């Protein structure tokens, strides 16, 4: 049987994975303590793809937590669900991050890579057969990129036959907080494209826009954002867990998702988002789902694909639906904008329906997309990189770390190579 083990990397992933796991636990009816409340047979059947059986019906999460600053783990361990977490899975370093990519990639990683490798292969030997892995981290995060880039490089070779899912958040375009973040981003993304097969791109500003748009609650928490992204991550994982005539395997999805290897960046998409009175003002029907499901405002990932073209689109539908409404809606959207897809491929839609509604709502869906909107993303990181490297701003740290500008020369060339890679297919 095929299962998945998770990696919680970077200080963002520390919030990401924590919220991600508790949603799963609350979804499946396990108490914070760990003694599962036997309530649903189907979720009682397929928990072993993610959780193992411990003593007394305690379902251990199969994920490993790695960082440098103990305070993050302590809060994570002392969170509402850190007790279900294993100190076996708590590996860390005794040094300060400095949010230096090279420190976590060359200095701090070197003595921790052995430890994390031992832990993961022990967990790999704990399970029988995997689909692959998934990683909560960020491309612009000091530790997460540093450990992530190291770990993705190493994990490629020993199991070269599994699913290397990646989940990274893109920092705010208006402000990156960290000023060496674009250096960290460029350093990370150079290796990322070489290793990953699947990637999710997420931006905080759009989430804030969604908060302004449908949440309408003025002041949320970043955990509230964590709750939203976890639901998207939960929704895509609901495919494997739940029954119904939908083909769930990511490899089943991947073969339908990407025509050529270099396309690993994929954008999420989610279903009904509702405001104060509109919960009881909404006629919950497949059309209005589909209309909202395909909204430029309903986008959250990077930027409006209105600017670009639609290469491949894949929407998974969770709840009690039928093959016909999705079929005609697929026709309706196809007729609505037949030109707005690429003439390179017709029928670029991949549909799945999960017959099991979520715990709290019935009609729901999730979307994963690959359009030509990422050009806006790496163009921004490009002219950012130009200005700083033109006058080598903030450089003596990395040369002090032992890093040379030649490393960046292929990094930008590889990225600008991907710049040519997108449009010349598209335009």
């Amino acid at each position: 049987m095929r299962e998945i083990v998770h990696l919680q990397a970077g200080q963002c992933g520390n919030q990401i994975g924590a919220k991600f796991w508790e949603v799963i636990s609350d979804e499946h009816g396990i108490d914070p303590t760990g003694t599962y409340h036997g309530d649903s047979d189907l979720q009682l059947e397929r928990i072993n793809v993610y959780y193992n059986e411990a003593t007394g019906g305690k379902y251990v999460p199969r994920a490993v937590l790695v960082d440098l600053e103990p305070g993050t783990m302590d809060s994570v361990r002392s969170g509402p669900f850190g007790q279900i977490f294993r100190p076996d899975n708590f590996v860390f370093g005794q040094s300060g991050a400095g949010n230096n990519w090279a420190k976590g990639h060359y200095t701090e990683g070197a003595e921790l890579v052995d430890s994390v490798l031992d832990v993961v292969r022990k967990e790999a030997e704990s399970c029988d057969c995997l689909q692959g892995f998934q990683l909560t981290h960020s491309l612009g995060g000091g530790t997460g990129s540093g450990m992530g880039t190291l770990l993705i490089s190493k994990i490629r070779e020993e199991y070269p036959d599994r699913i290397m899912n990646t989940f990274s958040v893109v920092p705010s375009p208006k402000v990156s907080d960290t000023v060496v973040e674009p250096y960290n981003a460029t350093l990370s993304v150079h290796q990322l494209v070489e290793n990953t097969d699947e990637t999710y791109c997420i931006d905080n500003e759009a989430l804030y826009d969604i908060c302004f748009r449908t949440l309408k609650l003025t002041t949320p928490t970043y955990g509230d954002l964590n709750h939203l992204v976890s639901a998207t991550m939960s929704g895509v994982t609901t495919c494997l867990r739940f029954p119904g005539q939908l083909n769930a395997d990511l490899r089943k999805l991947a073969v339908n998702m990407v025509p050529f290897p270099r396309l690993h960046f994929f954008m999420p998409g989610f279903a009904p988002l509702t405001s104060r009175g509109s919960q009881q003002y909404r006629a919950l029907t497949v059309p209005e789902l589909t209309q909202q499901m395909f909204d430029a405002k309903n986008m959250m990932a990077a930027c409006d694909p209105r600017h670009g073209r639609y290469l491949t689109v894949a929407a998974v539908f969770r709840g009690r639906m039928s093959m016909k409404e999705v079929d005609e809606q697929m026709l309706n959207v196809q007729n609505k904008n037949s030109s707005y897809f690429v003439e390179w491929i017709p029928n670029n839609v991949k549909t799945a329906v999960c017959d099991i509604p979520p715990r709290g709502l019935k009609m729901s869906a999730t979307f994963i997309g690959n359009s030509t909107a990422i050009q806006e993303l790496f163009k921004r990181i490009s002219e950012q990189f130009t200005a700083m490297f033109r006058r080598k701003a903030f450089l003596h740290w990395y040369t002090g770390e032992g890093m040379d500008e030649m490393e960046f020369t292929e990094a930008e060339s590889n990225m600008n190579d991907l710049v040519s890679e997108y449009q010349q297919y598209q335009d």
Binding site: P70, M73, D74, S75, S78, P87, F90
Partner: peptide, 14 residues
């Protein structure tokens, strides 16, 4: 208040 308990390693666990 930070429950600085798990941070303690075996030589420094108190």
């Amino acid at each position: 208040r930070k429950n600085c308990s798990f941070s303690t390693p075996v030589p420094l666990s108190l």
